[PDB]
Design a protein around this ligand. Structure first.
Ligand SMILES: O=S(=O)(O)CCS
Ligand code: NA
Ligand code: NA
Ligand code: NA
Ligand code: NA
Ligand code: NA
Ligand code: NA
Ligand SMILES: [Zn+2]
Ligand SMILES: [Zn+2]
Length: 259
């Protein structure tokens, strides 16, 4: 379950499908009008994402938007390739837009250096905090969740299965992790952002959470159980609270270990 490993795709809930790798989340939100893909995984994972979308019985040319959580290589490395395969527009938080266009992080990024560069993407533009991305029946809201990077966006929508509608959250990473030489102790505004983000996330309406790192909300456990109990296995409305709490506890640990 490394970041580029093949993973048989599956429906999470209604028109929300998992089409990511074994280690990195990507989600296809489908409609008879076209689809929104969230994240591209790694540069080598892109070929997994593309194969997974086709295996779910969709066409790459029907993907009209690609949404980015944040611009690290493990989530965004595959986006240029996916953009080229789909023709999509790529949406991202203002502060990550340039990284996606060039594939080069800013030196403000906790993992500048620590992760390599990756292919730059065409057809990127910024979303605003609060902005609604629309496509036919689909409506996805951007929520600014900076800190892990400056332009992090957590994305939300509603999916309905057999008349039962749930609030889905694709949770950007809330983790105080970095290059070995980067210190969160030396970047108080990054720390403050993170703290703001914990709070934003734990307030979200959150029936189904998909974490950018899928095991952060137990994806593989839930998915095995979905065989037995159906897609209720993914539903758990404390999930966003737990992700935020984990982030918060991780930050406190990190700051201490630094000093
Ligand atoms: O989680 S890792 O810091 O290993 C990858 C970047 S989000
Ligand atoms: Na696969
Ligand atoms: Na399925
Ligand atoms: Na399933
Ligand atoms: Na973003
Ligand atoms: Na959940
Ligand atoms: Na069910
Ligand atoms: Zn990251
Ligand atoms: Zn990551």
């Amino acid at each position: 379950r490394d970041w580029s490993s093949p993973q048989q795709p599956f429906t999470i809930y209604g028109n929300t499908h998992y089409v990511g790798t074994g280690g990195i989340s990507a989600v296809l939100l489908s409609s008879p009008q076209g689809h929104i893909l969230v994240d591209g995984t790694t540069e080598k994972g892109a070929q997994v994402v593309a194969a997974n979308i086709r295996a779910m019985g969709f066409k790459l040319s029907d993907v009209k938007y690609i949404l980015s959580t944040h611009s690290h290589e493990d989530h965004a490395g595959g986006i240029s390739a996916m953009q080229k395969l789909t023709g999509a527009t790529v949406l991202a938080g203002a502060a990550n837009v340039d990284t996606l266009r060039t594939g080069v992080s800013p030196k403000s990024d906790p993992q500048f250096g620590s992760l390599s560069n990756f292919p730059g993407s065409a057809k990127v533009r910024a979303v605003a905090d609060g902005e609604l991305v629309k496509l036919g029946p689909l409506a996805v809201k951007a929520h600014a969740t900076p800190g892990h990077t400056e332009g992090g966006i957590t994305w939300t929508w509603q999916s309905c299965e057999q008349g039962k509608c749930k609030d889905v959250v694709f949770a950007d990473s809330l983790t105080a992790v970095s290059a070995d030489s980067y210190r969160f102790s030396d970047h108080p505004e990054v720390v403050a952002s993170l703290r703001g983000s914990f709070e934003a996330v734990e307030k979200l309406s959150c029936d189904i959470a998909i974490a950018a790192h899928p095991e952060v909300n137990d994806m593989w456990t839930r998915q095995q159980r979905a065989a037995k109990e159906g897609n209720s296995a993914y539903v758990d409305n404390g999930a966003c609270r737990a992700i935020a709490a984990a982030g918060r506890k991780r930050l406190e640990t990190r700051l201490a270990s630094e000093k």
